[PDB]
Design a protein around this ligand. Structure first.
Ligand SMILES: [Mg+2]
Ligand SMILES: [Zn+2]
Ligand SMILES: [Zn+2]
Length: 1254
DNA sequence: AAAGAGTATTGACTTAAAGTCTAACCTATAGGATACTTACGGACACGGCGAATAGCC
RNA sequence: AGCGAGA
DNA sequence: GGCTATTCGCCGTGTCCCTCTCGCTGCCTATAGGTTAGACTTTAAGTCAATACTCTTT
């Protein structure tokens, strides 16, 4: 059977010997099962004598029927009596009467047979489908001697044909003499005599033409010989049969697959490989390019021990009888045609019939291995293609991406989800029936242990009728058993989290609200699947790694994802905001009474608020004795070691803020700020950074509770009366309609064309839009429900508010342009019919655009994951000096350090490569620090901008990356572990903001991202500066010519065809003709292809370019992704070098070889004679990088299955099963996280003191 | 010390099963001779190939 | 195999 | 003067197109051999039942 001894997996061409070695028999009849008794036939497609017994442990006839007869073969029927399941294991084989060629190596462009034999594809096809003869052997020296003899014999034949030729000419002459005698002897017409005479000499012209035909037929054949050599096709078999009958010897010409077999027999690989290598080394140009193409496959066969006989097949293997009859029918066709061929050869048949039958057999094998590849697919009942033996493997519905990496699983459930706010963050409701069913084994065990049932089957009966006693035991068993909750699609790592389940009454998984965002799961009919870990390892993994309370911060940007939002944030905003002039406010008036605003303790404040005296949102002064004061008050009152739990201090704030601040931990200082969602996020981020995660969970949960309660009390409701239109709307409408009418009049006088007036109206109405928006904003009070919800950060944006009251605005044309009408009505006021009809365009287009974009995003994520499927941490530190530089703050022209806007995703969570230096002073922060917020603050304060940080790009470790160079784990909040699969995390983080990554020709959306990671030359390829020099732009419409005089160098280069419509990117000032340029300044407007920038500026500059561009496109929509994930991908992109000089070491020119292996070869060859094989770095798309891996089982799982398997087979490639996809497919443990060889084999034992306790 | 039950004998009766033989009834194969002798989306990418010009035979 | 539908 | 090679264009074929879930319909005749199936005649295995003696329990 099989064990863990799978260290290496090998694929290769299977020779006929191997095929008949695998087979346990030889099916030779097209009979599946008897129509009447319904049993397999002898020697059929389901023969029990071959593939085993249908029902286990008896032969066909039944002489032996029990287990003790194990491994015995019954003499009567020959069935080996054993287990029945072996029918899924044993193979047959069909011994083809004539050879056939495997399709994959024939039709898959480039035709590997064609390249191996150097036969043109059309030619080869005509050979192997019996349409044109091919020679396979020829003669040499005796060829010379009989060529002289044959020169004499063709002199004889030419003389004979010329003799008949002149005899025909003389017969013409005599018939012409008779004709002229008739013409000029009898009385005939003046022209009729010349009619017959012209006709006669016309007959002679055709006779001389026939002569020329005979000449041709002889000398052309002689010329065919005089330069004859094999592998030479001959169409028009008439010439072939002529040659054979005249030249039966001196060549052997064949037709079909066996012809190719013979061609491969008389084919020495070493001589052809040497000749091709010589041609490449000395010959240049297109000829070299083809010769290189063939050398690929020719070397593939040379280096490996597999001979090219495997391409032509003598026997076809028979898949075991589980396929069970679409595919089976194809097999029947093959067997029918093979048997008929055998009979035809036996009886003795004309060449035509047997040749046609051979062609039919070839076509049948073709259809079997791949139906529809060549010619129309073989169709079945209902006129549909038969699912060929290869269609099982390819596509979405192929075996690789429906059944191997993705499987359906037992012990799982699914239900709709309903918000439950009463649950703790680490809990999830689970309906009683679903839990009972899922846990039916465990509850059975417990109720048999409890003696509620006598035995297992009685217990199973007990549960199947849900007897009343089986609920208490159920509560006992479910306790302390984690469960995973997935919500498809799992866009990112936080799509699946482990909760502790709890029973709930009715049929609905009660989810915790705070994790809603993590799932993006919103309660209107989403269905969340539930999975149940079983093994001790799985339960530990779920309880520890996956627990919902253990994953608060996003793995992408680390911002808290359990943060309160929507309702809770609104409640907190209402609680912590301050309303001057409210009841119970503070007033310091004296001379008549005290301030009457202060309170002894917060408890006093709540007791007053219970009375209708103190509002929760009034300014007051409370003597706090249990909340830590802010930094300044602590530093003033206590200064050094203020022990707050007993100390008291006077706080001038609102009671609501006090009630809030009690929810934070004891150590957190008093905040005293209005709780915008932003401020909440900052608070939670700081809390997670400082305090342990469990505290973060508890605080977040308390926050949710308070938020919901106070949102209920917040008094936020929507009514028409609460939606206040702006009173100045009509005046603005008139004011801007006046300009619109003016533009209409100017157009009606021909002042401007349609496009110009469309743009003018667009501008006028957009201005009107902004004006009414401003009027509405300033018209609203602050306490309004709508402004309250929007401005608190709870949800929605002011554009929606403005559309709700005021004016919706310009509506998109279904092409994408702007309707110049535009809509002038608020939804509150109610849109008119035509305004609504115009509006529908935009919404329908948006909905449509969502679908295609999510499809493309999913595909992109698949690509990125595959490329990064093997980027996992391996070492703590490589100590590599190399690093990248990040700018941080930029010097102000007046002199000042303004923090760079995009610092939170660039330098945060990075390890310093070199010690910081200040004014050539001491080190503020030395090498090897996480560079968390205080560090960057210190650097900014001291006055340093550029800092050298370590990154994955400049990581010295060959395998994966090291912990330090990668930097901080964004999710865990500390340094990375030695098993984290940072590659998968990176890719998923890039892909997650898909769809929400929208757009508004050079691309700028998800297509632009794809292009950046695909290395595709952009459409708007703006030229870039190459060498510093004064520019001499010339004027060419669509073909700007651009000269640049090199500062030092060679020759200025002019760019023949560059688009004029672009706008020159500004330089040190707008870039203009006559200006000295840089080595990288973008000349024109638009992007630049990354290959060019690489070739100009080395690997570092192209790296920085790619990261900057992708980050830009993402930032353009406001999604924050840390730079490091991108760095990981671009690192994966730059790992291969192109070979210019082969040196003398097995490196074909143009080969894409890994840099680590490149260096290894170099250190191998420096000794024993040095031949440095020069190479240059190169940038290759994500797809190519993935498909260039050293693992065929992963590349095959990825895409374009047929080609990758054919290539790997020809190379006899062996997969070492080191990646993640592979380990998934074969079902052994991934080498990542808890699977690597340092954790996978930990030894655990008690202590000697513990043994003493025993 | 007595009685009842179990562990044996033996014969007597009984029924499944099973090994021949039949028979008859399906079942698989071959053959049929006046003369006729031709069907019925769209984008990316690479590799197999138009149009040109110059040099060499 | 084909239809329709939810997220 | 013509053909081929080194240089461009041009066109054709192949590959890909997110995930998860729910319900419903689609001529004839002649030979020879197998074939089990079906009944007859054996068994072989099973069931009943008389009898009696010995051992254990009350
Ligand atoms: Mg929803
Ligand atoms: Zn048998
Ligand atoms: Zn490193």
């Amino acid at each position: 059977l099989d064990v863990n001894f799978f260290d290496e997996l090998r694929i290769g061409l299977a020779t006929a010997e191997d095929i008949r070695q695998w087979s346990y028999g030889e099916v030779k009849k097209p009979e599946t099962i008897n129509y009447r008794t319904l049993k397999p036939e002898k020697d059929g497609l389901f023969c029990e004598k071959i593939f085993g017994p249908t029902r286990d442990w008896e032969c066909y006839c039944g002489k032996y029927k029990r287990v003790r007869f194990k491994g015995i073969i019954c003499e009567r029927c020959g069935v080996e009596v054993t287990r029945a399941k072996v029918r899924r294991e044993r193979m047959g084989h069909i011994e083809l009467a004539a050879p056939v060629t495997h399709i994959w190596y024939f039709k898959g462009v480039p035709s590997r047979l064609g390249y191996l034999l150097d036969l043109a594809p059309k030619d080869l096809e005509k050979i192997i489908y019996f349409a044109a003869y091919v020679i396979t052997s020829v003669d040499e020296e005796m060829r010379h001697n009989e060529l002289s003899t044959l020169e004499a014999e063709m002199a004889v034949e030419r003389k004979a044909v010329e003799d008949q030729r002149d005899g025909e000419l003389e017969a013409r002459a005599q018939k012409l003499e008779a004709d002229l005698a008739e013409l000029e002897a009898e009385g005939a017409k003046a022209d009729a005599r010349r009619k017959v005479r012209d006709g006669g000499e016309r007959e002679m012209r055709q006779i001389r033409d026939r002569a020329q035909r005979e000449l041709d037929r002889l000398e052309d054949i002689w010329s065919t010989f005089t330069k004859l050599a094999p592998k030479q096709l001959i169409v028009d078999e008439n010439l072939y049969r002529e040659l054979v009958d005249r030249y039966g010897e001196y060549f052997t010409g064949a037709m079909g697959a066996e012809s190719i077999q013979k061609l491969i027999e008389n084919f020495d690989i070493d001589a052809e490989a040497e000749s091709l290598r010589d041609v490449i080394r000395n010959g240049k140009g297109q000829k070299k390019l083809r010769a290189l193409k063939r050398l690929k496959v020719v070397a593939a066969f040379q280096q490996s021990g597999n001979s090219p006989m495997g391409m032509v097949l003598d026997a076809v293997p028979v898949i075991p009888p589980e396929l069970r009859s679409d595919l089976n029918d194809l097999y029947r066709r093959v067997i029918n045609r093979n048997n008929r061929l055998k009979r035809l050869i036996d009886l003795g048949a004309p060449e035509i019939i047997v040749n046609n039958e051979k062609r039919m057999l070839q076509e049948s094998v073709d259809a079997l291995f791949d139906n529809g590849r060549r010619g129309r697919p073989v169709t079945g009942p209902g006129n549909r293609p038969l699912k060929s033996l290869s269609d099982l493997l390819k596509g979405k519905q192929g075996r690789f991406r429906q059944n191997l990496l993705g499987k359906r699983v037992d012990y799982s459930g699914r239900s709709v989800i309903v918000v439950g706010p009463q649950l703790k963050l680490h809990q999830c409701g689970l309906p009683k029936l679903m839990a009972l069913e899922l846990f039916k084994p465990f509850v059975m065990k417990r109720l048999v242990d409890l003696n509620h049932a006598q035995n297992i089957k009685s217990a199973k009966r007990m549960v199947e009728r849900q007897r009343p006693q089986v609920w208490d035991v159920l509560e006992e068993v479910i306790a302390e058993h984690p469960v995973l909750l997935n919500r498809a699609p799992t866009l990112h790592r936080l799509g699946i989290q482990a909760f502790e389940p709890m029973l709930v009454e009715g049929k609905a998984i009660q989810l915790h609200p705070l994790v809603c965002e993590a799932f993006n799961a919103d309660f209107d009919g989403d269905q969340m699947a539930v999975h149940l870990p079983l093994s001790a390892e799985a339960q530990a993994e779920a309880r520890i790694l996956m627990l919902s309370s253990n994953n608060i911060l996003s793995p992408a940007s680390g911002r808290p994802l359990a943060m309160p939002r929507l309702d809770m944030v609104t409640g907190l905003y209402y609680l912590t905001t301050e309303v001057p002039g409210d009841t119970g406010e503070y007033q310091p008036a004296s001379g008549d009474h005290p301030e009457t605003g202060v309170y002894s303790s917060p408890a006093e404040a709540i007791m007053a608020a219970d009375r209708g005296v103190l509002s929760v949102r009034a300014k007051i002064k409370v003597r706090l004795t249990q909340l830590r004061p802010p930094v300044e008050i602590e530093a003033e009152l206590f200064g050094h070691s203020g022990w707050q739990p007993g100390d008291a201090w006077m706080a001038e704030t609102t009671l609501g803020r006090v009630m809030f601040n009690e929810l934070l931990p004891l150590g957190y200082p008093f905040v005293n700020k209005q709780m915008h969602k932003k401020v909440q996020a900052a608070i939670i981020n700081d809390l997670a950074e400082r305090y342990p995660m469990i505290v973060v969970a508890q605080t977040v949960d308390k926050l949710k509770d308070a938020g919901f309660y106070w949102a209920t009390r917040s008094g936020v409701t929507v009514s028409m009366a609460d939606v206040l239109v702006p009173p100045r709307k009509k005046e603005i409408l008139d004011h801007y309609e006046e300009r619109a009418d003016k533009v209409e009049k100017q157009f009606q006088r021909g002042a401007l064309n349609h496009d110009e007036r469309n743009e003018a109206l667009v501008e006028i109405w957009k201005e009107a839009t902004d004006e009414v928006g401003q009027a509405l904003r300033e018209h609203y009070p602050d306490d309004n429900p709508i402004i309250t919800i929007v401005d608190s950060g709870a949800t929605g944006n002011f554009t929606q508010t403005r559309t709700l009251a005021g004016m919706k605005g310009l509506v998109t044309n279904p092409k994408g342009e702007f309707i110049p009408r535009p809509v002038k009505s608020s939804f509150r006021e109610g849109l008119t019919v035509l305004e609504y009809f115009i509006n529908t365009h935009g919404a329908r287009k948006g909905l449509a655009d969502t679908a295609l974009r999510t499809a493309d995003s999913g595909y992109l994520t698949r690509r990125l994951v595959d490329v990064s499927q093997d980027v996992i941490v391996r070492e703590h530190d490589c100590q590599t000096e190399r690093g990248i530089v990040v700018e941080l703050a930029e010097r102000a022209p007046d002199g000042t350090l303004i923090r760079d806007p995009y610092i939170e995703t660039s330098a945060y969570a990075r390890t310093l490569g070199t010690d910081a230096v200040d004014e050539a002073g001491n080190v503020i922060v030395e090498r090897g620090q996480d560079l968390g917020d205080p560090e960057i603050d210190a650097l900014l304060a001291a006055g340093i901008t550029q800092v050298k940080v370590r990154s994955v790009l400049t990581c010295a470790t060959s395998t994966g990356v090291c912990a330090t160079c990668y930097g901080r784990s964004m999710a865990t909040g500390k340094l990375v572990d030695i098993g984290e699969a940072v590659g998968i995390v990176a890719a998923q983080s890039i892909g997650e903001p898909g769809t929400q990554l929208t757009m508004r020709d050079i691309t700028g959306g998800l297509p632009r991202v794809q292009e950046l990671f695909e290395a595709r030359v952009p459409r708007g390829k703006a030229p870039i500066a190459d060498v510093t020099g004064r520019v001499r732009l010339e004027d060419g419409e669509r073909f700007y010519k651009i000269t640049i005089v090199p500062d030092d160098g060679g020759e200025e280069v002019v760019y023949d065809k560059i688009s004029k419509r672009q706008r020159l990117r500004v330089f040190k000032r707008v870039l203009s003709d006559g200006d000295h340029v840089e080595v990288g300044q973008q000349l024109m407007e638009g992007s630049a292809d990354p290959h060019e920038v690489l070739r100009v500026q080395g690997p570092r500059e192209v790296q920085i370019h790619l990261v900057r561009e992708v980050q830009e496109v993402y930032r353009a929509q406001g999604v924050s992704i840390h730079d490091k994930h991108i760095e990981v991908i671009v690192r994966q992109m730059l790992r291969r070098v192109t070979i210019i000089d082969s040196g003398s070491t097995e490196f074909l020119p143009g080969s894409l070889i890994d840099r680590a292996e490149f260096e290894a070869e170099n250190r191998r060859v420096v000794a024993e004679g040095g031949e440095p094989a020069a190479g240059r770095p190169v940038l290759m798309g994500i797809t190519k990088a993935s498909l260039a891996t050293d693992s065929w089982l992963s590349a095959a799982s990825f895409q374009e299955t047929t080609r990758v398997l054919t290539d790997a087979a020809i190379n006899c490639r062996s997969d070492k099963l080191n990646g993640l996809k592979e380990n998934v497919i074969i079902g052994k443990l991934i080498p990542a996280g808890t699977g690597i060889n340092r954790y996978r084999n930990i030894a655990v034992q008690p202590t000697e003191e513990a043994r003493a306790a025993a």
